[PDB]
Amino acid sequence: KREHWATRLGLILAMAGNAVGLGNFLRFPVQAAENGGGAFMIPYIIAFLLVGIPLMWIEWAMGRYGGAQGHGTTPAIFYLLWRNRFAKILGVFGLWIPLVVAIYYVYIESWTLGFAIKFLVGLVPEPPTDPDSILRPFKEFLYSYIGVPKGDEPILKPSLFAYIVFLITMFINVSILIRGISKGIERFAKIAMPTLFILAVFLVIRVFLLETPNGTAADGLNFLWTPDFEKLKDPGVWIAAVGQIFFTLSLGFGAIITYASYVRKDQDIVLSGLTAATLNEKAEVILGGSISIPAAVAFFGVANAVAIAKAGAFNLGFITLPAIFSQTAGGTFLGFLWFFLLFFAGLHSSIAIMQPMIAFLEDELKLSRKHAVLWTAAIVFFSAHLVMFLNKSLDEMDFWAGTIGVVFFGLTELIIFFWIFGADKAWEEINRGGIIKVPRIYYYVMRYITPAFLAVLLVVWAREYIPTHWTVWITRFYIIGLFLFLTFLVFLAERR
Ligand SMILES: CCCCCCCCO[C@@H]1O[C@H](CO)[C@@H](O)[C@H](O)[C@H]1O
Ligand SMILES: CCCCCCCCO[C@@H]1O[C@H](CO)[C@@H](O)[C@H](O)[C@H]1O
Ligand SMILES: CCCCCCCCO[C@@H]1O[C@H](CO)[C@@H](O)[C@H](O)[C@H]1O
Ligand SMILES: CCCCCCCCO[C@@H]1O[C@H](CO)[C@@H](O)[C@H](O)[C@H]1O
Ligand SMILES: CCCCCCCCO[C@@H]1O[C@H](CO)[C@@H](O)[C@H](O)[C@H]1O
Ligand SMILES: CCCCCCCCO[C@@H]1O[C@H](CO)[C@@H](O)[C@H](O)[C@H]1O
Ligand SMILES: CCCCCCCCO[C@@H]1O[C@H](CO)[C@@H](O)[C@H](O)[C@H]1O
């Protein structure tokens, strides 16, 4: 036997939680603003239907199939679906990807905590018109916290505050994970997910009331959701939608499979998975599209709305919005809520992105939950020093694991399960015990459409983003060693 989810609600709130921390409140509207505004819904909804939902259900079934046999991670689950030596090595990726993401994500999550503390106590720059006059003091503020050097220097010089807050952040993640699934992860989601919703609605209401001489939030929603179907001719818009889907549903990160391995043998996953995925989609379109960009376009105007979009999602949430809140009534408290929202949202994703390593140490190496959590914490905390001190090291990990990895591994899940294990055998496994059954239209979708989409996407990135700065070689060296480390642990699990 193993740990199990206590309630259907807690399972859904925990499953939906591991995608709200991926920054979709910033990620989605930026992608929508740069791919036809409201016309981006056609690629986004289709990618949500032809790629997201089928790959989501697939990850739910692979976890429950593995969890019934006591295996919450993919080095063992792949071996069940494909009795082969190549399947165990491919399974290492489903343990390597979430571990590498945690090595830099928890540190980023710690930024939101430290920024929430500084805003709460008022230790923020308070300017004083032009955007650079307002944005630059908060650019220095983030760069002084992270320790970004002034030039091409390879060394980061993070503040002691950022380091201490990172320690505190790791302590919070351990406190949730060391309690377990029901006592820890599920108890956290049932409380924080509703709190995130209430807190997000307040920001939405507070943003809709923004009025500056340069624009209104109505212009922000108008700019964000004005459709332009001329963009739909460009295949790049469809590339951005499918890749976006991997983040609204957290596909390929190894988190859905591990969380689903604690779903009991016959408990429903079809309806419970569709609800958690629908919760993810609506929460990022409504709440996410009503805060970040509307507040940005309202403050700077429609003239800078194009520049805000090209600036990117991360700059919007760590530079632009704090600078906007700085110039609004009660904005020091408003900035606290924004970073409090990002922290507690990210807290759902970090505990879920470290559970596969914990489940592996538990299921395959027979370690206690206490020792599995603390060893996982030690591996992540130690390795994060590479991200905290080496410039552009975060980017290198985010590229191999966060970008290419989840799309490559998502294609791997769909092939091992729906082709090698048997499509009919896989279809039985998904719809088994389902309160609602998957429509048979998704059979052709899972077997042909979704793998084709992921194959087209992988080649596009293999052509565009395949080709100085020797510090990335150190990062490549370290994450490759982590793969050798996990392969050795998988090997040690076979001997036991
Ligand atoms: C606590 C978590 C903070 C969430 C911030 C994530 C916002 C996403 O930000 C985007 O992420 C991409 C990679 O994922 C990068 O390539 C983009 O440059 C960046 O703008
Ligand atoms: C691998 C675990 C080792 C923990 C010790 C690492 C200490 C690095 O921490 C450093 O301590 C300095 C003290 O002034 C601070 O100025 C730096 O901001 C901080 O990065
Ligand atoms: C100054 C910041 C302190 C943060 C600590 C509280 C953060 C909220 O997190 C809580 O921490 C508790 C620690 O025991 C855990 O028991 C709870 O499970 C967890 O929800
Ligand atoms: C940030 C958006 C995602 C948060 C969604 C959490 C919504 C509250 O979550 C749950 O929804 C159920 C249906 O109303 C209620 O019965 C439960 O009391 C509540 O915990
Ligand atoms: C009493 C509860 C108030 C909820 C938050 C509202 C914050 C008010 O904020 C104010 O609202 C005005 C429009 O009414 C605008 O001029 C500005 O957005 C702002 O000055
Ligand atoms: C350096 C990585 C630490 C690995 C996790 C172990 C944390 C050490 O904690 C140990 O846990 C044991 C549990 O029985 C206790 O008996 C010990 O008193 C305690 O020191
Ligand atoms: C899982 C969330 C990933 C964190 C988002 C990345 C934020 C770190 O910073 C980002 O690094 C990127 C590297 O590609 C750059 O493209 C962005 O310009 C930069 O903002």
Dist. CA 98 → ligand 7 center (Å): 17
What residue owns the CA closest to ligand 2's atom 7?
Answer: 163
Dist. CA 386 → ligand 7 center (Å): 16
Q: Measured on CA atoms in the order 54, 57, 61, 62, is the torsion positive or negative?
A: positive
Number of C-beta neighbours around residue 384 at 10 A: 21
Q: Is 122 left (phi over 0), alpha (psi -120 to 50) or beta?
A: left
Experimental method: X-ray
Task: Show the 3-state SS of 152-186.
Answer: CCCECCCCHHHHHHHHHHHHHHHHHHCCCHHHHHH
User: From the CB of 461, is ligand 7 less than 6 Å away?
Assistant: no
User: From the CB of 395, is ligand 7 less than 6 Å away?
Assistant: yes
Cβ–Cβ under 8 Å, residues 402 and 396: no
Cβ–Cβ under 8 Å, residues 115 and 145: yes
What residue owns the CA closest to ligand 7's atom 15?
Answer: 395
Q: Which of 357, 358, 371, 373 most suits a substitution to test ligand 6, by most atoms within 8 Å of the C-beta?
A: 371
User: From the CB of 34, is ligand 1 less than 6 Å away?
Assistant: no
Task: Show the 3-state SS of the chain.
Answer: CCCCCCCHHHHHHHHHHHHHCCCHHHHHHHHHHCCCHHHHHHHHHHHHHHHHHHHHHHHHHHHHHHHHCCCCCHHHHHHHHCCCHHHHHHHHHHHHHHHHHHHHHHHHHHHHHHHHHHHHHCCCCCCCCCHHHHHHHHHHHHHHHHCCCCCCCCECCCCHHHHHHHHHHHHHHHHHHCCCHHHHHHHHHHHHHHHHHHHHHHHHHHHHCCEECCEEHHHHHHHHCCCCCCHHHCHHHHHHHHHHHHHHCCCCCCHHHHHHCCCCCCCCCHHHHHHHHHHHHHHHHHHHHHHHHHHHHHHHCCCCHHHHHHHCHHHHHHHHHHHHHHCCCCHHHHHHHHHHHHHHHHHHHHHHHHHHHHHHHHHCCCCCHHHHHHHHHHHHHHHHHHHHHECCHHHHHHHHHHHHHHHHHHHHHHHHHHHHCCHHHHHHHHHCCCCCCCCCHHHHHHHHHHHHHHHHHHHHHHHHCCCCCCHHHHHHHHHHHHHHHHHHHHHHHHHC
Q: Count CA atoms within 13 Å of residue 300 on its CB side.
A: 24
What residue owns the CA closest to ligand 3's atom 15?
Answer: 175
Dist. CA 361 → ligand 4 center (Å): 32
Give me the phi and psi of 212, to 5 degrees please: -125, 160
Q: Is 254 left (phi over 0), alpha (psi -120 to 50) or beta?
A: left
Strands 211-212 and 215-216: antiparallel
Q: Measured on CA atoms in the order 349, 351, 355, 361, is the torsion positive or negative?
A: positive
Angle at alpha carbon of residue 309, lines to 305 and 313, rounded to 5°: 135
With CA atoms as reference, report the closest residue to 100 among 490, 351, 405: 405
What residue owns the CA closest to ligand 3's atom 8?
Answer: 172
Q: Count CA atoms within 13 Å of residue 412 on its CB side.
A: 25
User: From the CB of 76, is ligand 4 less than 6 Å away?
Assistant: no
User: From the CB of 324, is ligand 5 less than 6 Å away?
Assistant: no
Give me the phi and psi of 35, to 5 degrees please: -150, 45
| Contacts for 138 with CB less than 8 Å, ≥ 6 apart | 124, 125, 319, 322, 323, 326
User: From the CB of 374, is ligand 6 less than 6 Å away?
Assistant: yes
* Ligand closest in space to the Cα of 120: 3
Dist. CA 170 → ligand 3 center (Å): 11
Q: Which of 110, 160, 166, 167 most suits a substitution to test ligand 2, by most atoms within 8 Å of the C-beta?
A: 160
User: From the CB of 200, is ligand 4 less than 6 Å away?
Assistant: yes
User: From the CB of 27, is ligand 1 less than 6 Å away?
Assistant: yes
User: From the CB of 29, is ligand 1 less than 6 Å away?
Assistant: no
Report the DSSP beta bridge partners of residue 212: 215
Q: Measured on CA atoms in the order 38, 40, 43, 49, is the torsion positive or negative?
A: negative
Q: Give the CA-trace dihedral at 295, 116, 9, 278, to 10 degrees.
A: 30
| Residue 117 CA, closest ligand 3 atom number | 1
Dist. CA 402 → ligand 1 center (Å): 10
Q: How far, in Å, CA of 6 to CA of 83, rounded?
A: 32
Q: Which parts are annotated binding residues?
A: 85
Cβ–Cβ under 8 Å, residues 215 and 301: yes
Q: Which parts are annotated binding residues for phosphocholine?
A: 85
With CA atoms as reference, report the closest residue to 297 among 275, 279, 281, 321: 321
Dist. CA 192 → ligand 4 center (Å): 9
Dist. CA 379 → ligand 3 center (Å): 21
| Contacts for 491 with CB less than 8 Å, ≥ 6 apart | none
* Ligand closest in space to the Cα of 170: 3
Task: State CA 490 to chain mean position distance.
Answer: 26
Cβ–Cβ under 8 Å, residues 107 and 387: yes
User: From the CB of 312, is ligand 7 less than 6 Å away?
Assistant: yes
What residue owns the CA closest to ligand 3's atom 5?
Answer: 172
User: From the CB of 398, is ligand 7 less than 6 Å away?
Assistant: yes
Dist. CA 487 → ligand 7 center (Å): 28
Dist. CA 99 → ligand 6 center (Å): 22
Q: How large is the greatest C-alpha to C-alpha distance in the chain, in angstroms? A: 69
Cβ–Cβ under 8 Å, residues 154 and 471: yes
Dist. CA 378 → ligand 6 center (Å): 12
Number of C-beta neighbours around residue 451 at 10 A: 20
| Residue 349 CA, closest ligand 7 atom number | 1
What residue owns the CA closest to ligand 1's atom 19?
Answer: 314
Dist. CA 46 → ligand 3 center (Å): 40
Q: Measured on CA atoms in the order 107, 108, 113, 117, is the torsion positive or negative?
A: positive
